[PDB]
Ligand binder design. Structure first.
Ligand SMILES: [Ca+2]
Length: 44
């Protein structure tokens, strides 16, 4: 049993597993926003 949850609010979202939070505009901007390989998703 493993039910992990995020640690961010509003349009912002947690950097996958990291403790970083990206803006809502991150949604398909043009390039990486996090740097770990998580925010890249949600854009193909
Ligand atoms: Ca991105």
């Amino acid at each position: 049993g493993s039910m992990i949850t995020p640690s961010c609010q509003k349009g912002y979202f947690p950097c996958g597993n990291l403790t970083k939070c990206l803006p809502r505009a991150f949604h398909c901007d043009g390039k990486d926003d996090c740097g770990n390989g998580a925010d890249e998703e949600n854009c193909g």
